[PDB]
Design a protein around this ligand. Structure first.
Ligand SMILES: *[C@@H]1O[C@H](CO)[C@@H](O[C@@H]2O[C@H](CO)[C@@H](O[C@H]3O[C@H](CO)[C@@H](O)[C@H](O)[C@@H]3O)[C@H](O)[C@H]2NC(C)=O)[C@H](O)[C@H]1NC(C)=O
Ligand SMILES: *[C@@H]1O[C@H](CO)[C@@H](O[C@@H]2O[C@H](CO)[C@@H](O[C@H]3O[C@H](CO)[C@@H](O)[C@H](O)[C@@H]3O)[C@H](O)[C@H]2NC(C)=O)[C@H](O)[C@H]1NC(C)=O
Ligand SMILES: *[C@@H]1O[C@H](CO)[C@@H](O[C@@H]2O[C@H](CO)[C@@H](O[C@H]3O[C@H](CO)[C@@H](O)[C@H](O)[C@@H]3O)[C@H](O)[C@H]2NC(C)=O)[C@H](O)[C@H]1NC(C)=O
Ligand SMILES: *[C@@H]1O[C@H](CO)[C@@H](O[C@@H]2O[C@H](CO)[C@@H](O[C@H]3O[C@H](CO)[C@@H](O)[C@H](O)[C@@H]3O)[C@H](O)[C@H]2NC(C)=O)[C@H](O)[C@H]1NC(C)=O
Ligand SMILES: *[C@@H]1O[C@H](CO)[C@@H](O[C@@H]2O[C@H](CO)[C@@H](O[C@H]3O[C@H](CO)[C@@H](O)[C@H](O)[C@@H]3O)[C@H](O)[C@H]2NC(C)=O)[C@H](O)[C@H]1NC(C)=O
Ligand SMILES: *[C@@H]1O[C@H](CO)[C@@H](O[C@@H]2O[C@H](CO)[C@@H](O[C@H]3O[C@H](CO)[C@@H](O)[C@H](O)[C@@H]3O)[C@H](O)[C@H]2NC(C)=O)[C@H](O)[C@H]1NC(C)=O
Ligand SMILES: *[C@@H]1O[C@H](CO)[C@@H](O[C@@H]2O[C@H](CO)[C@@H](O[C@H]3O[C@H](CO)[C@@H](O)[C@H](O)[C@@H]3O)[C@H](O)[C@H]2NC(C)=O)[C@H](O)[C@H]1NC(C)=O
Ligand SMILES: *[C@@H]1O[C@H](CO)[C@@H](O[C@@H]2O[C@H](CO)[C@@H](O[C@H]3O[C@H](CO)[C@@H](O)[C@H](O)[C@@H]3O)[C@H](O)[C@H]2NC(C)=O)[C@H](O)[C@H]1NC(C)=O
Ligand SMILES: *[C@@H]1O[C@H](CO)[C@@H](O[C@@H]2O[C@H](CO)[C@@H](O)[C@H](O)[C@H]2NC(C)=O)[C@H](O)[C@H]1NC(C)=O
Ligand SMILES: *[C@@H]1O[C@H](CO)[C@@H](O[C@@H]2O[C@H](CO)[C@@H](O)[C@H](O)[C@H]2NC(C)=O)[C@H](O)[C@H]1NC(C)=O
Ligand SMILES: *[C@@H]1O[C@H](CO)[C@@H](O[C@@H]2O[C@H](CO)[C@@H](O)[C@H](O)[C@H]2NC(C)=O)[C@H](O)[C@H]1NC(C)=O
Ligand SMILES: *[C@@H]1O[C@H](CO)[C@@H](O)[C@H](O)[C@H]1NC(C)=O
Ligand SMILES: *[C@@H]1O[C@H](CO)[C@@H](O)[C@H](O)[C@H]1NC(C)=O
Ligand SMILES: *[C@@H]1O[C@H](CO)[C@@H](O)[C@H](O)[C@H]1NC(C)=O
Ligand SMILES: *[C@@H]1O[C@H](CO)[C@@H](O)[C@H](O)[C@H]1NC(C)=O
Ligand SMILES: *[C@@H]1O[C@H](CO)[C@@H](O)[C@H](O)[C@H]1NC(C)=O
Ligand SMILES: *[C@@H]1O[C@H](CO)[C@@H](O)[C@H](O)[C@H]1NC(C)=O
Ligand SMILES: *[C@@H]1O[C@H](CO)[C@@H](O)[C@H](O)[C@H]1NC(C)=O
Ligand SMILES: *[C@@H]1O[C@H](CO)[C@@H](O)[C@H](O)[C@H]1NC(C)=O
Ligand SMILES: *[C@@H]1O[C@H](CO)[C@@H](O)[C@H](O)[C@H]1NC(C)=O
Lengths: 371, 371, 371
């Protein structure tokens, strides 16, 4: 089911008013080349310095936009003397042995102290080197942790700049088409006279006059709009006994009883003629179908982030450091000596009788002589 | 060499069938604004959190799409006594000296032990701090190593999202042009009648009827297609004696002997007239050349990656740590003493004869008295 | 103020020359699919390996482009013996005590040496682990510091590749429109004859002949250009007593005294008639204004980098490491002993007279006997 022979009330102009139309068309586009430094980063120093590492894409993007008883006592004397002498010998040996052992102890202790001092020096050097290296690590750590975010924001603003570039290229591709439309509107209407409805001025084109504009052209079309029009029932064809008679460069204005081939753009009824109407056969209407399907582009569909990530993403986690736990590396006699020191500090007739006998003997001799 | 005066067999319609054409044109486009979170990252948490750092480009991209024998013994006694006394003095001095030296050794050893304990404590604090700091370093190391890859995939999907945006802007720029074509097809054919071939319905336009569609317009053009046509040899001009006579709004259908100015769209031969043909001079054909060169944009050519990289890329490599190598910091007498200890443990008449003589003397005196 | 009734000198053709126009139109575009590996990174290995982490955007971008005196002496003997004995006892006790204390010192010193060796071993293990871990840290540090710059350049070249993609989609969207123009130029001019000025060949179209081209179509339009034309003063309408008479499919060539409705495309003056001119009322000119405003897209304006940065940017700075400063962990008697050692090395009649008396007594007895 379609609509061919049906006569409906369509307006046919009974009259016109002269008219003019001022039609503006942009024909050129300013080359809006873009500074990406100010656009993406602008005044912030770190992102500006990072943009330098983003290459010359900037000019590249501008590339798009710039175009487009005497004996025993003597024996005891010898005894005490020899005991004392042997004692002296063992004291001297005790002394020598104790001195040697004490010196070896004083040696090993001082060697332990020397090892302590050398270990202290070596460990101090170790700790200085470690502090320096780990400080360098943490400092460059913080710098990288900042710069990765600054670059992430730069990358996210790159998408905005590229959307800007894309929309600008779109606009310039529309500009060149509007310039071609300007060219043909100049051709068909300033050099000539357009026969098409509303083309080159509202109504029907009589004349055109071109004028320039900073990026466009304006046409003053003197035309005529229909001052008055009347709705006549009209059939683009009428089928008489199986033969389709359809007007020749006109329309079947249906009069009260007759069909006239009137002018489409003016009420001027003119009777059906085979010179006013072409004739067909079989009363058959060819049905056409047209769909101007504008191109639908192949949009870039992606996987979900997890699949495209774990495809290459390695989830490497470095281990907790564990290092060696050095925490697991664990007078009475002097009194006796001093006591024995202080303790060692602590334990540090015949002639007369015989003479009397001799005197008595002499006395007796004297008495005997006296008698 | 071109083709002007040559008459070739071109079809001229002997007849027509009435016809209708249903012509669909999309006039509007849905604003397919895009969520970038679901598009790029979707459900994965880490990339979603990272997208927050990518700025509001999302809305920005939507911005595009929402628009668009007694004396000697006494002397020896004195000797042993004085020897013993002097020995005692040297024993006491040996004792005092050994005690002082032994106490100094016991002091320095305990000082070495104290230094050991203090060094152990200081080193334990050192190792705890180092473990904590390097664990922090390695942990944030792993996190950054993951996030840089997650952001790399985000950045690579940003290109897909921007290609989507670009293709959508392309499609909308085609949509607005199809809407303008819809406007002119309404104008020249519903308000009027198109004179152009196949424009507004297959064949030749008789009438049009517009109807809307969710994003388009459909025109029912009642037209006429040529039911029958015959191939007549035709010359767009014929040059009689150096003067080019070319039909006036018609074509030179070459009859068996004559040229007729027939209607282009219908076989209706009509004899050459100067009202049927314009006349030229010199038989000269102007040759025109036209190339509608669609704009070829300035594509953003780049250097190779090495030149744009080493331009700013610094290949800094931190050195291998080297730190101090602390690995390079390297009884007989007691027996004699004990032996001498245990060794030191080990070496810890006249009256009668004279009385007999006196008795003999008294005996003699008695005998003498008896005589 | 506009321009309707004013008659200006416009050229009307007095004559024509036959002509031909060779019109080339590109109708198809080669699918310039792009390898992103060679484009962005090319031959450099590290950026190539990094591109693998950028996902399959490559094909996605191709998705766009592929489409689109005896007793005292004895007492002194006992004295020296007991003094010596007690001295021996205190020497033995001094010996035992000194030996025990010296052995305890030799024990504690060797324990200090053992603790030194164990601490050395534990610290060597600690230093080896620390060196390994911090070397790993610094090495992956340098690698990440290089890769972030390589990826930054990749991301900056992604913008160039996307600008290329956008411009290519622009070009293909122009290609399909040029193909539609080719379609209509074939329709209205090879199947028919164009009535529009310069459309399908310079001048006025007589015939067209289509021919293919690797991505285009060329039409040979036999047309006629105006050989001669004369500038006649012309008014698209003239207002007689308030009624606008404007020519019917012609122009008012202003003769010396009269207006003729001449053919626009040929000097053929024909007198004003109501069949040559439509008539209006009130002498009123309708003034129309038209501006074909090509779509200006909503460009993605961004904040300054600081606001979009500090929105999520955290300026975390890890502290300077400070670790424990281990630098803060700080014979006369033997002479006396040896002196006393060497010093200790250093201090290691009655019968005859009575017999003579007895002999004198016997001598006296002998003398007495002799008397
Ligand atoms: C039709 O409407 C247009 C708006 O959609 C508008 O075109 C505009 O014309 C002005 C003229 O003042 C332009 O303004 C500019 O002024 C000068 C001259 O071009 C330039 O040097 C400036 O940099 C600035 O761009 C507008 O740019 C222009 N609009 C657009 C979108 O380009 C007019 O009202 C009509 N068109 C014409 C051509 O007049
Ligand atoms: C369409 O039908 C209309 C109605 O028949 C017709 O208009 C009519 O035209 C006739 C002829 O001119 C007139 O007939 C009478 O005209 C005058 C009166 O005006 C008399 O003096 C004559 O003797 C004659 O009887 C009708 O008056 C007139 N009717 C109307 C309503 O205008 C159209 O001419 C027809 N159109 C075509 C193209 O045929
Ligand atoms: C990167 O880091 C996460 C580590 O915290 C990582 O997670 C872990 O993935 C492994 C391997 O898929 C899982 O190991 C076990 O997984 C299932 C769960 O029961 C078992 O059947 C397996 O046999 C295997 O033993 C861990 O369970 C999982 N851990 C967690 C906490 O999820 C993720 O892949 C990454 N994280 C992010 C946010 O991307
Ligand atoms: C010409 O062919 C077109 C296909 O190239 C197709 O246009 C399509 O029309 C349908 C109508 O059902 C649209 O479908 C949609 O349905 C409604 C109404 O628009 C929307 O709300 C939905 O979201 C959905 O988009 C198609 O979208 C549309 N095609 C395109 C590419 O837009 C028709 O067959 C013909 N055109 C018309 C206007 O009918
Ligand atoms: C970043 O890291 C690479 C280091 O492994 C770096 O490479 C090296 O570049 C230097 C600079 O030219 C070369 O140095 C020297 O080249 C020769 C080799 O002996 C000498 O005779 C010269 O006098 C000069 O001193 C190194 O040779 C080169 N490394 C190697 C192993 O050849 C690269 O620039 C970067 N690597 C990547 C993958 O981008
Ligand atoms: C109108 O001017 C065009 C230049 O703007 C140019 O079209 C060009 O035609 C040549 C033909 O040799 C193409 O060259 C190519 O050659 C073959 C055939 O297409 C291809 O396989 C090659 O890969 C190569 O592309 C040009 O590509 C083409 N120009 C463009 C921009 O596509 C002609 O001078 C005129 N047009 C025609 C259709 O002839
Ligand atoms: C526009 O005005 C022109 C000037 O009046 C007019 O041309 C004139 O046409 C008349 C009639 O053909 C000529 O009148 C004379 O013609 C010949 C001489 O050539 C005499 O034999 C006749 O008796 C008559 O007197 C004029 O000579 C001629 N003038 C010129 C300069 O050509 C145009 O015809 C007018 N155009 C229209 C459409 O009316
Ligand atoms: C990231 O690193 C910079 C650190 O070097 C950081 O800068 C510092 O920002 C703080 C926060 O405002 C400022 O702090 C104090 O500033 C004045 C100084 O006394 C006080 O009166 C305020 O109350 C506030 O407490 C620091 O002064 C500022 N650093 C310096 C040297 O001025 C920046 O935000 C970041 N740097 C870059 C390049 O982005
Ligand atoms: C060992 O014996 C001596 C002698 O009895 C004592 O020593 C005297 O020590 C006091 C200590 O103040 C001095 O004031 C005296 O001058 C010392 N005596 C002499 C003679 O000088 C004491 O019992 C022991 N000596 C010590 C412990 O040094
Ligand atoms: C020093 O000499 C004494 C006395 O001869 C000895 O000591 C005795 O040691 C034994 C060891 O078991 C004890 O059972 C005895 O009781 C000790 N004697 C007395 C009287 O009690 C030994 O040769 C030396 N003393 C030592 C080595 O302590
Ligand atoms: C203790 O006294 C002895 C005996 O007077 C001295 O020793 C002698 O030491 C010298 C050292 O060269 C030897 O050559 C002699 O052979 C030793 N004497 C004997 C008998 O062998 C010395 O004054 C002291 N002994 C020491 C210091 O060992
Ligand atoms: C055409 O109009 C006439 C009167 O104006 C009417 O009688 C006739 O039925 C109409 N044709 C159709 C097909 O409706
Ligand atoms: C229409 O035009 C005719 C003839 O030109 C005239 O008689 C009639 O009055 C006009 N009507 C209007 C409304 O202009
Ligand atoms: C090491 O020190 C601990 C402290 O708790 C103490 O018991 C002892 O002196 C050492 N440990 C051992 C097990 O010897
Ligand atoms: C035109 O056709 C006629 C017959 O149809 C023929 O005689 C003549 O040679 C043709 N013209 C040319 C230039 O071939
Ligand atoms: C063509 O039209 C003519 C006149 O209208 C007619 O005589 C002839 O039969 C028609 N031929 C065909 C094939 O329709
Ligand atoms: C340190 O230890 C080594 C172990 O090989 C051993 O020879 C000695 O006791 C020390 N080294 C030196 C050179 O004194
Ligand atoms: C039109 O031209 C004629 C002579 O060619 C002149 O007399 C008249 O003034 C012109 N009309 C206008 C409005 O200038
Ligand atoms: C213009 O055409 C006419 C008639 O065709 C002729 O008389 C006149 O000489 C031609 N003039 C030129 C310059 O061709
Ligand atoms: C530790 O060494 C310093 C070296 O300057 C020295 O004065 C002393 O032996 C120790 N320091 C103290 C305060 O005891």
């Amino acid at each position: 089911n379609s609509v061919a022979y049906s006569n409906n009330s369509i307006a046919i102009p009974t009259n016109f008013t002269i008219s003019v139309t001022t039609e503006i068309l942009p024909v050129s586009m300013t080359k809006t080349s873009v500074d990406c430094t100010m656009y993406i980063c602008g005044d912030s120093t770190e992102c500006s310095n990072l943009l330098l590492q983003y290459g010359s894409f900037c000019t590249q993007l501008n590339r798009a936009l710039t175009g487009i008883t005497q004996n025993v006592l003597y024996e005891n004397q010898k005894l005490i003397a020899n005991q004392f002498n042997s004692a002296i010998g063992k004291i001297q040996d005790s002394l020598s042995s104790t001195a040697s052992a004490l010196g070896k102890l004083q040696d090993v202790v001082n060697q332990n102290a020397q090892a302590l001092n050398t270990l202290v020096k070596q460990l101090s050097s170790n700790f200085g080197a470690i502090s320096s290296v780990l400080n360098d690590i943490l400092s460059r750590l913080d710098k990288v942790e900042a710069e990765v975010q600054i670059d992430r924001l730069i990358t996210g603003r790159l998408q905005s700049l590229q959307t800007y570039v894309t929309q600008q290229l779109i606009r310039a591709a529309e500009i060149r088409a509007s310039a071609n439309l300007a060219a043909t509107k100049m051709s068909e209407c300033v050099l000539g006279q357009s026969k098409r409805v509303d083309f080159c001025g509202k109504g029907y084109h009589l004349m055109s006059f071109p004028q320039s504009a900073p990026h466009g052209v304006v046409f003053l079309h003197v035309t005529y709009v229909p001052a008055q029009e009347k709705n006549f029932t009209t059939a683009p064809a009428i089928c008489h006994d199986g033969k389709a008679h359809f007007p020749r460069e006109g329309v079947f204005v249906s009069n009260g009883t007759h069909w006239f081939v009137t002018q489409r753009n003016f009420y001027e009824p003119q009777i059906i003629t085979t010179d006013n109407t072409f004739v067909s056969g079989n009363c058959d209407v060819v049905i056409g179908i047209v769909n101007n399907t504008v191109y639908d582009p192949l949009q870039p569909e992606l996987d979900s982030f997890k699949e495209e990530l774990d495809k290459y993403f390695k989830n490497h986690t470095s281990p907790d450091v564990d290092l060696g736990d050095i925490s697991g590396i664990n007078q009475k006699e002097i009194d006796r000596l001093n006591e024995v020191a202080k303790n060692l500090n602590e334990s540090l007739w015949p002639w007369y009788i015989w003479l009397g006998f001799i005197a008595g003997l002499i006395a007796i001799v004297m008495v005997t002589i006296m008698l």
